């Protein structure tokens, strides 16, 4: 997961 | 623990839902291509971030995408037109693309790490989106013998999602493009009428509203  | 309720942005759809989509539940929206399932997902990813007196849960979002349909620009549009800072709203969405159904399944375990991290902060995860829940399963488990196998794997995946919803007080929102069994908590059938108008009906929920909600796709996500 990565920040949008 | 008491459940929370995330407004969809439509009063009509909220009434159909008893106030909004629920935490400690999996809500599945299903319908044909173009029925607005992903628009509802984008809208919820902004609404959940609002404070509770505005229909949110002050929450963070995790999003598992299987069709490359997440659009940061759409989040920005919805956020800005609701008085919010688009970059901050985007910051609170944690995003992953699932390569195949086995990776999709593993990403649920991966997600628990961030859920635990954020749990006792002021923006705990409150929404987990899986869009599409079923597309990889459809493509991978196909042909003679696949109905049973696919249904087993999907049920396990949904059990993992139910555990996160229930253990961490999260609304899980999943999409499905459509006599098979289903194990989501609540199933909402969406369809497109005309222009930006959409119609929602609850399925196999005889104890809840039997009518239909109608809403439009707009620059605020969805609205009456």
From Swiss-Prot, chain B:
One GO biological-process annotation of the entry reads:
DNA repair
Q: Which residues bind ATP?
A: 31-38
Q: Which UniProt keywords apply?
A: ATP-binding, DNA damage, DNA recombination, DNA-binding, Nucleotide-binding
Q: Which domain of life is it from?
A: Archaea
**GO-annotated molecular function:** ATP binding; ATP hydrolysis activity; ATP-dependent DNA damage sensor activity; damaged DNA binding
- Give a short account of what the protein does: Involved in DNA repair and in homologous recombination. Binds and assemble on single-stranded DNA to form a nucleoprotein filament. Hydrolyzes ATP in a ssDNA-dependent manner and promotes DNA strand exchange between homologous DNA molecules.
| Family of this protein | Belongs to the eukaryotic RecA-like protein family.
The protein, known as? DNA repair and recombination protein RadA
